[PDB]
Structure formats: C-alpha cells, structure tokens
Amino acid sequence: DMDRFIDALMKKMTVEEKIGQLNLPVDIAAKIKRGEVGGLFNLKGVEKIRDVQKQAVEQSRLGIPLLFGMDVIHGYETMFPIPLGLSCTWDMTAIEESARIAAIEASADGISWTFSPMVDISRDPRWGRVSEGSGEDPFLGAMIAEAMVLGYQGKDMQRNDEIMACVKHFALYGAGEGGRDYNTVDMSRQRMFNEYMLPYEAAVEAGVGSVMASFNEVDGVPATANKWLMTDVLRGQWGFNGFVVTNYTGISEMIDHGIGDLQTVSARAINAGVDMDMVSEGFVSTLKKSIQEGKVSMETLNTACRRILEAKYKLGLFDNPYKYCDLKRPARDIFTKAHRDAARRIAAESFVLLKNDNVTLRPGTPAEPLLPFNPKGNIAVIGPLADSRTNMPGTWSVAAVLDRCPSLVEGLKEMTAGKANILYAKGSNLISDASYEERATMFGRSLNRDNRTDEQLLNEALTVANQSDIIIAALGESSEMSGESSSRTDLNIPDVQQNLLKELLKTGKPVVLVLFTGRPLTLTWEQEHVPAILNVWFGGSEAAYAIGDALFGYVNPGGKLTMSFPKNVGQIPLYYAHKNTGRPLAQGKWFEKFRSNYLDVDNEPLYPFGYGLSYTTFSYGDIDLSRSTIDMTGELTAAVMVTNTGTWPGSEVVQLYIRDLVGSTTRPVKELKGFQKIFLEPGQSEIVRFKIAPEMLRYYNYDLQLVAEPGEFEVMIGTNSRDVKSARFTLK
Amino acid sequence: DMDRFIDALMKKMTVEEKIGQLNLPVTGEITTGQAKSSDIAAKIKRGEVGGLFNLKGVEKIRDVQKQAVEQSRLGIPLLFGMDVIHGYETMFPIPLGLSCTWDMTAIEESARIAAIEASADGISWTFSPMVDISRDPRWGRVSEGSGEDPFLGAMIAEAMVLGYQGKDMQRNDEIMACVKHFALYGAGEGGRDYNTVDMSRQRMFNEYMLPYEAAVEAGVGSVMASFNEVDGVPATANKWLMTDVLRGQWGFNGFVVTNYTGISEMIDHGIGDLQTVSARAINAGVDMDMVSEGFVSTLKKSIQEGKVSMETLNTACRRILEAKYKLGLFDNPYKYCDLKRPARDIFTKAHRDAARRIAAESFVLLKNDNVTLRPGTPAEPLLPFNPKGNIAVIGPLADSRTNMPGTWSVAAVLDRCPSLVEGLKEMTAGKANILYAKGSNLISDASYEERATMFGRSLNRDNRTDEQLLNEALTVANQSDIIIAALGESSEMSGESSSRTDLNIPDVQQNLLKELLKTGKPVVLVLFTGRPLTLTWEQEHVPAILNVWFGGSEAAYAIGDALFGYVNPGGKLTMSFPKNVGQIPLYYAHKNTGRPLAQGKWFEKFRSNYLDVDNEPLYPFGYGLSYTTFSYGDIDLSRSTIDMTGELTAAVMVTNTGTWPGSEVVQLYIRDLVGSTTRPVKELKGFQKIFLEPGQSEIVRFKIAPEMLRYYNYDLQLVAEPGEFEVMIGTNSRDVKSARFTLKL
Ligand SMILES: OC[C@H]1O[C@@H](O[C@H]2[C@H](O[C@@H]3[C@@H](O)[C@H](O)[C@@H](CO)O[C@H]3O)O[C@H](CO)[C@@H](O)[C@@H]2O)[C@H](O)[C@@H](O)[C@@H]1O
Ligand SMILES: OC[C@H]1O[C@@H](O)[C@H](O)[C@@H](O)[C@@H]1O
Ligand SMILES: [Mg+2]
Ligand SMILES: [Mg+2]
C-alpha cells in the first residue's frame, strides 16, 4: 500500500528534503548527498546511471532513488521515423510497437522516464516542432497519444522494460504566432477544447504518468504558472493523478515573459500545480523563503512532493532502485537486428507517395510510372541528402549513433550490388547561404561543405546524370531545419537544390524526387514538373534501406499525410477541419469577387489532409447507412465496399469524416472520426464498416458543455479528406 | 419630446409596419455586393422599408423620400445610406494612408467635407468609420482602417465620428455615422477576407476593441455588425457582442445594422435556416436587416410562434425611429433633399485644395539616400528636386486617372482625377519636359489584371508585348535626367474581397524597375499601395522611395508638391511592413515571450527566432523620414515615483538638425515591465506632431497618469497595477529614448 509507505517516508522529511524531490537539475554528487535532487535528465549509459543511483540510495539521509529522464522521441538507438512521418502510417499497432521497442532499449540503458509523446496540434508548418508531433488533427492525434503511452508504459509500468511517459507540451504550444518557436499563443476556450486539447486528454486518460508544461503563454499567463491549465483542466476536468514537470528553465523564463522575479514566479508555478522544476532551481533556491512568508503553504509543498514520490513508487523504484540498471541488458536489447528490421518496415510504411505520373520511357509504348522500378543499369543518386549518414535519422535522435546510419547512396549500393551501378554526385550545397547551412546542420549534421561553387557542383552532377538511366534526386531539408528553434518563413526546397532539380529535369532523363523533410513544404513547382515525388520525411536509422524497399517495389507506399501541404506561405493557416464562413467559395469558382478567397491563389492546399497514393488504385462504392435516423441512445453502421482496381497488392487508409450540418455554433466542414487501414490483393474487395454513435457526435458548445445536438449529419468516407463518398442521417 | 412622439407613432403601427422599419433593401447604380433588391416602390407604399443605400443623387433621393412621406400610410421617412469612406466627390487619401498624417484635425476636416458633400446630395447616413484593427497585411481591407494600433485607431475613430456628425447631427451638413465592423473582422484567418476569427477575451479587449468603444463614446449613431464569427457565433447573432458589450458595458444608445446580406450569410456559416438566424439576430441586438430580407419575410411567423417577442420587435423598431428623429427627419423629411446644394457644395476648389494638402501630408518617405549626380559635386538626396530638364514618368500607375482615388470611392467621378503625368505636366509647364511610357502591365497574368482593375479601374491593357512596353520605356529613360517610377498596386488590389498571399510589387513592374535602375539614371520609386508590401529588394536597390498610398482625387498634384519640395514629407507608418509574408503577423506591441532574442543577436539557437530572416519588420510602426533630420535629447521625468492619485510629466527636447523646415511626429510609448499577465514590450500612449524650422528646438511634454497605465487583466478587470514602468519617446516605435518610473498604491 503506497499511501502508508509514502505517509511514513514524508513524516521523516525535512522541508529541504521535500523541496529537493521537486528539483530536476542539469557538484551534482554534493546535491544528491544533501537530498536536493528528485531526478536527472539526458544522462546516457547504464553504468553512469547505476553509479549516480548508488549515491542517492546509500549516501543521502533518506536514500530516496532518482528518476532518470531522456528525450526518447522516436527511438533510443534504433531510430524509427520522426513522429510526423510515423503518424502517416495511420497504424496504431506499429506506433505502439515503435514505442515498446524504444522503451525496451532505453530501459536496458538505465532510463526510467521518457519526455514523450509530443502531442501538440499545429496548423502552422513554419514551426520546426511539427516534426515531433502527429499533424493537424485531434482525433488521430489522440489515437496516437494513447498508442505511444501504452507502448512505453504498458498496463502499469511493473515490467523492467516499461518506463514512465510524459505527455508534452501542455498546452497549445503549436499555435505560436508567426510559427516562430516560443512565440505568443492566443485562442478562445472553445477552440482549445474542440481543436487543440483532445490529444493531451487522451494521454491522461491512457494513464500517462507525467505531463510537461509548455514554454508559451496561454490567456496571458505562461503555461508553467497557469493554474486554470495545470489544476482546473488537468486535475479538475480530466482526473490526472500524476505529476507536472516544467520544460527546460520554464520557471526562470517566466521572468523574461514579464510576470515577476524568480521567487514570485516559482511560488506561482507550484501553486498552479507544477510539481518538478527542470533546471531553473527556482524551487530549490526560493521555496523555503516562500513558505516562511506565507506565499506557498506546507500543504502545497507536501502535495507536490507526494506526487513525485508516488511516481517513483509506481515505477517500482522503492522496491528496487536499480530496476533499470542491469549491465547485461544493453548487449541484449539495444540496436538488435530484430529492432532494426521493425524500424525498416515502419519507415517504409511511413512514406507518402505524392505523385507518380506516367512517363514515356520506351519509344512507341504507352506511358508508365517511374515507381516502382527494377534495380538495374545506371542509377544516379544526386543531391545534398544523397550521401549523408548523420541526416538520415531525423532531429530528436539524441541517443542515436549518427554516423552509423547508412547514407542513401550506401544503402542503395548494398541493395543493388551486382544488379546496378549507383552513381553519386553531391549536386548542390544544402542552401546558397553558408551561414544558414551551418545553423541548419548543427548537432553533428555537417554535409562537409567545401570551396566548390554551386556551378562546379551542378556541372559534376549533370556529367553523372547524363551517364544514367534514371535519376534519384535526394533533396529537401537537413534534419535540423526542423525540431526545436527551427522555424522557417519560406517552405521551399532550398534555392540551390531546386535549381539543381530544374537542371536534372532538363537532361531529359527520368527524375524521381525523394523528398526529405520534417514539415510540410510548398511544392507547386515540383508537382507541375517532376514525374514522381516520394516524401520520405526522415525515416530513421534504417531510412536508406526503407527507401530502397519503396523505390524497387518491395513495399507498396501507403502513407497518408497528417498535415495539409499549402501552395504558399500566404495561405497559412490552412487546415481541412475549417469553418464554412458566411461567404464560402464554391468548388471550381475561383476567383469570385465577394467570396472568401484570395486574388492570387485558390483556397486549396496542394495536398490535403489524408492524401497519399499507392502503386495500385482503390475504388469506393456508395455508402450504406444501416439507419437513416437514430436517437440519443442509438447507433448505426456506415459501410462502404473498397476494391483494389489496379495491378499491385497494397494498403489503403479508409478515412471516416463527419460534418454536423447545423450547429448552435459554427461547426467544421468535416472532422475525422475514424479510420481503418486495409490490405487488398489485386481485384479483391472489402466491406469496411464504421460504428457511429452519439458520443462521437459530441462537441464543446458556446458554454463549453460537451454535447451532441439533434439534427442532421453528413457521413463521409474516402481515400483522403477531399475525395469522399457521402451519406446523411438524422440525430433525434 | 422624442419619447412621447415615438410612443404615439408606435401606437399606430401594425406589426408589419414595425418590421418594415427594420428593412434595408439595396438600390441605385452602386455595386458593393452580389445580392440585389426587387419591388421597392410597392414595398415603400406598404411601409415595408426603413431605409435604402447605394442610391446616388439628390433628385432620385428626393423622389423616393416623397414616395415614403406622401404615399405610405404613416409617412415615415427613409434613411439614405452610402459608403462615404474617404470622400464623396472630393477624394481624400484612403483611410490607411490618411492615418499616416497622425493629424486628428485634418482627419476630422476630411470627414467634415465628405459630410458637407454627401448631405448636399441627399445622403443622411455613412457606413463609416471602418476601425477594424489588423496585424495582417494580406487582408485587403487594411486600406479602409487606420492600422495596427488601438490607441491611434481610437483617436481617429473619434475624429471621424465628430467630423461626420458634429455635436448632435442637427445641421443640414451633418450626417449619421456608422462604426464598422463590430467586431474583430481584421483578424480573419490567413488574411483571407471573411474567414474565421478566433481569440481570447483578453486579446479582444486589450488589442482589438478600443476603437469601436471610442466611436460609441463619441456618440456614433449606428454600428454595423461584421461578417465573421466570434467564439463560433456569427457576429450578427452574437448577443454577447451586440447586447452585453455594446449596450450593457458601453451604454450604446443607437442601432445596429447588419452588413450586406449578413443575416442570410448565417445560413452558410451553419447555424440555421433564414427564420432561425433572423430570430437570433434580432434577439442578439441587431436592429436593421441590410438586403437579406430575413426580418421582413420571417419575423411575423417568429412572433406568432414565440421565437421573438413583441417587446424585442418594439425595441428594435424604436431604435430606428429614434435615429430618424435625432437626424431631424420627422421635423423635415427633406432636410438633405435640397436640389440646389450640389451645385455649390460638391467638388469645390476649397474642398479640393484641402484634399491636396491632406494628401501630401499622408505620404511616407521610406528612403532618400544620397546620390552622386555629377562627378566632383558632393552627393545629395534625389528628393526634393527642382523641376527642370527631362523628367521621365514611367509605369502602369504613371498615366491612370481612375486609379488615383483609391478603393472605396463609389461616388467619385473616376476619370476626372488628373493622372500623375497630367499633374506633373501642369506643375512643370515651361520648366521641364515630362516624358512618358507605360513600361509594363500591372501584372503578367491578364486574368489577375482584370480582377485587380474592376469597378472602372482598367489600365487599358492592350495587346502589346512586354518587350514593346519595356523597350519604349528604356528609350524614354535613357533620354531623361531623372526617372519617376510610378509602380505598385492598382486600387482594387485592396478593399473588400481583395486579399493577397504575395505582397510584392507585381512581377512585370519589378522587372521594369530593375531595368530602369540598370540605365544608371536616378530612379525615384513613387509607390502606390493599399497595404504594407514586402520591399526588401527595393529598400536595397532604389535610392528614393515615397509611399503615396492612394492619395485621392488630387493625388497627382500632392505628389508633385512632395517631389518638388513644396511640402516636406512627414507621414509615419501606422502598420508594420514585413520583410516577408512568413513573418506575419508582425506588430510592434508584442509580448516578450519567455525566450526573447537580444538585439543584434540574430540568429541564436533556442531563442524565439527564425532560421532564415530576423524578427524585425523592414519598416516598423511609426516609421517615416523627412527632408530634414530631428535629434532627441534625454527624457526628463518630473517624478520618479507616483501613486494612483498622482501624475508626472515626461519631456524631451526635439531639434531640427537638418537644412529643411519640417514636421516630426513625436511618439510616446509605455512599457508595463511586470504584470500579473504578460504585458507588451511597448504600447503607444500619446503623440504630438510638431513643426520645426532648421536649427529650431522644442520641448515636447507628455502627461502620464495612472489611468493611461490600465489594462484588462486575467479576470477582464480594467486596472493599473503598481510596479515599474518604462517611458519611451522617439521618431518611430523602434528608435526611442528611455526612462523609468515606479507606480505605488
Ligand atoms: O530534454 C528535456 C527537454 O529539453 C528541451 O530542449 C532544451 C534543450 O535540451 C537539450 C535536450 O532537449 C536534449 O535531449 C539533450 C541531449 O542531447 O540536450 C539538452 O541540452 O536544451 C536547450 C538548452 O541548450 C534548451 O533551450 C531547450 O529548451 C525540449 O524543449 C523538451 O521537449 C525536452 O523534453
Ligand atoms: O454599402 C454597404 C456595405 O457594402 C459592403 O459591400 C461592404 O462590405 C460594407 O463595408 C459596406 O458598408
Ligand atoms: Mg447539428
Ligand atoms: Mg506592472
């Protein structure tokens, strides 16, 4: 019984020792001896960790063991795709598997706590942290949040390969103005609950052990001092029973935000419901003084302390402080063949085929797609992402061995050895400006830029291209053009690369764009002029091999976008689940004076939410509804037959949207409410069935009551958010 | 008294007649929307019409008023509305340009003149001022407002209402104003006109609402509901806005009109059928139905069914009748129907002379670098210059009459305004030769050009190639001593339903500009625009840049005045000019964030900043140059510490350190350093426009009282908090002198 144990332990504790449980610092040995340390973060290596734990257990008065945290975001050493790429699998089993594998690996190396999952909704692709999330949609975001929490923690974190998760960043961090990381957030309460909050709630309701507070203000109060968020919503509305950790120096940053000095903002944080202080040392250096002056009560301190101690108890650390400190496990569990094969499979499943038009290859024959192709003849692999190992895994790969990942050229060479020649040319730098390239390739991602001019690089590339039968243009972002503090105001393939791509197309050889990116990009030029475009995001440590599997047809691409790809930055924010407005522009009517539309571009994204092609095609019959009417207690089934009408086996993500036609407040033109990923052989059919019940039709009204209102609903099922079949029913 | 008279009149009225007062059909030759009204004469006879709008001309208006007064049962006279936005026939600058005067007297004057002209021609009601705050230059309606700042916006709202209405609208040259668009319409997502608005209540009150409140406080007779949703409810059905804020909090005694088809647009918004949304509108506090016919066709059914009460109808009807009464229309229905006034009041030389003065005052000198014009002569700025030799005027805005007034000039005689070439030819006759070439089309794409030049603003695009156009212009430029490049937007690239996703000078014009620069002849960019543009390339390469917005009917002459040094530019920007559209929204009064980038530190990993451009606008709020220079000494604060009962004075000496007489807009910014909520890094709280001779100084003093330091806190309480404040005074929002004081209880 935890409460009795913790009561007894807390009876023994000084105020200094209770305070110390709340400290999560970046000397360290001295602090641990005095009981001033509740946990540590991003310390790598089971041996170092076991040694630090030893100090806590046997050289501090009470022997209270430490939490050891790390950003295990999309892998420990075996790297899966960046989360945004992973989300395009639309495969909750695979997602859970990826998190399970990462937990196995991290736990083997001493880690008991991951700062994952990141579930921040964003509709702004300028923000570099879209790479860490799961796109623009709350329903899908919520499903993913559950899958990740369950993957990490399992049922109750009792196993030694199960770790504590931490949903971040609570809340609304993805709506930062201008898409500039850390910038002001502002929105209505109604928008919070209908459009942003569901994934945080899903994590809490799946039993996530911890929550991390965000860097942004909400309603003019930094999240870290926002009691409405950290107590009233998180505990009061959602029943959260864990603890809240700040983000990095989150407390001291409130001084810069402009709401007071260190003591004042520290007191406000703890009274808001913040439990653990990451790096600031505002809790450890000011809380006693605040308790003496009456600004923080002993009851508040004890609650904060108690939540930390309960997390430690739930992880099994009081039973065994060294639960995660098995020196034999690393060789057994970390970077194994089985894990790496899982990563390669999931990587290939994450890729989104954006375009694959018919091209005239053989004279006189019908035109045919470039993808897939048989590896033979001379295959050119050209561009600054063609031969970089360190840029393959993606940002947020802090425990990965970067220079162990095969480059694309390396991986394709292996897979084609004896069947084709792989011809390499760098082609261009990452971007024209050298200073930009440096900051874009921070944290060990250098492309070894030298004194060769753009013109020299280009000329070499065209020599190689003109000796080839097909060109793989490996282009796009470096991995650190996304992640934290990596906001962009332009979302093109960088200048020199796009010029390279233009020049490769002019050789007359077939060109496949293999696009590396951590975010949506503005690709109208590429969509017009490049025959085949495969978005590979950043596929992880096995990316090169997975890309080969797609290119050669060993895997039929089935990924679907989870974030809208705009035509230009001037359309931001562009998202599928938008209100109709009072003056909707009808389909095909652009431009029309006095409708909601721009002078210079239509309203549409280049690629909408849920978009993704396959080497086969799928046909949808009409929707069958089991009932035309249901009441508040009823239910119906929406059924559609899906038929593989092409020549390839493949998967299709069948997507369910609902539109509430009339509301007491304005309602989106559609919302994702379900999906099923199916696999079909050529010629084969499957009746896909969705359950629809009133609980699915609920939303937060004007007074923030979560209600389904009677009236008509339109059910939409299809291959993406744009191309759908339609039927209607009535809620009575 | 009014109450007796109105009770009496309302005791005679059928339900249909009460509903009729709420009905505002459209008519006339003016187009400001899609839907059109039918059967108006018969509707007036049956008492089904409370007003009309878009009818131009005292003769037509008199006829219709006579139908209402003499041929309806009760003879209730009509309101006659028009968008009188920045002039009737004499056109002043577009409001965004006008705001750059920072001169409330001139602004009030411009409204006075518009009212004199509109009233002479039968109009009793203008749908003005438009006071929507915007931080998004994609939105075309920024041209209609006064920029990003609520303080300056509040002052302009008051000035405009006072100008139109006077003390109480009793005179025959005073008309009823209509503050618009209530509320938040300038925050439409993606800067796309009519799109979703969403924000916190704190942001509404601290950042967007003040100019509406200032109009109400100045006695504005009417309010127009906005097109957008607020908290998921279309503004036109938002009872919290239209009753609780507007009447409950602010004490507004007037009536609310919808925008054009605002009620039926609620169907598309998705909150119900015509009958349902009409009922919700009137129950929200909307009094008059522009075009939709929702009220007239469904309210009686709604009253029968109990969806709307008789008391609700009565209240709305009563507000309309009271507006008419306060305008003097029950006393004299023909008050604005004097058939002789147009010949003496409209487009007079005195009005046009005022417009010209006000237009030159509106221009913002963005750049005026020294140029070496002849070897061995020290470098001087291109502007101003003595008109002589050969002056080329080149570009698609060089010889266009119809584009000079700007958008929202629905009563102007477009082809009577002189083009820039014509204006400059008149002003330089006998002194200089004006050479001319169009140089380029407006934009490469003909279909864009067509929609960009609707409403009679064609540039007369012909079938010449870009090469024909360019070559003719280069033959002119190579013969000229100086080149005036008249480039930028057509007037209908801004205004309603004119949102842009790119904010450059259009492709073929920028190419023309590049080629003119390559001649080696000195180039002046005379920039026409209704919005902030992205001008980093122009700022790098063009020696002189004069933003002339759209100057009105006398723009050409006013431009000549600036160019030739008869007027020294003194405009300051009221909206931030971004370096690119990916920085949007960019605004001076921003929060610090928890990770502010220190000055001169771009780029720094883990600060709030972008990989590819710094955080700064190309030109900040309050930016603007002069033909002279001004220098500021240190700030003297009369006190270090005040309490809530107290006050202090901030003073600075401003000296004209250059060679030209000129005006400077001295701007006061205040920063509340610490708050219970995060406070902006600065907020404009005062300004004074001074005029100094060369070498002359003046001590500029600002009164600082705790009532200026209040803001809406977390609980939406308008309070000043004790603590430290920073006072900032300077020539723009960026380049400022600083001092500190403490507020105590
Ligand atoms: O890991 C805690 C927390 O870190 C926040 O980013 C910090 C960053 O911290 C990095 C850390 O993220 C990374 O995992 C390790 C290991 O490579 O290195 C640390 O230095 O550091 C800078 C300080 O230089 C901070 O500005 C930044 O905020 C993330 O925001 C958060 O998601 C993560 O959970
Ligand atoms: O003329 C009536 C109304 O016309 C509409 O087209 C405009 O949007 C309004 O701003 C104007 O006041
Ligand atoms: Mg409904
Ligand atoms: Mg303060």
UniProtKB/TrEMBL annotation, chain A:
Residues annotated for Mg(2+) binding in this entry: 660, 662
Gene Ontology biological process terms, A to Z: glucan catabolic process
Keyword annotations of the record: Glycosidase, Hydrolase, Metal-binding, Periplasm, Signal
Enzyme superclass (EC): hydrolase
Gene Ontology MF annotations: beta-glucosidase activity; metal ion binding
Protein family according to the UniProt entry: Belongs to the glycosyl hydrolase 3 family.
Gene Ontology CC: periplasmic space
Cited InterPro entries: Cellulose_Degrad_GH3, Fn3-like, GH, Glyco_hydro_3_AS, Glyco_hydro_3_C, Glyco_hydro_3_C_sf, Glyco_hydro_3_N, Glyco_hydro_3_N_sf
Catalytic reactions of this protein: Hydrolysis of terminal, non-reducing beta-D-glucosyl residues with release of beta-D-glucose
Main location: periplasm
Compartment annotation: Periplasm
Provenance organism: Bacteroides thetaiotaomicron (strain ATCC 29148 / DSM 2079 / JCM 5827 / CCUG 10774 / NCTC 10582 / VPI-5482 / E50)
Fibronectin type III-like domain: residues covered: 652-721
Protein name: Periplasmic beta-glucosidase
EC number: 3.2.1.21
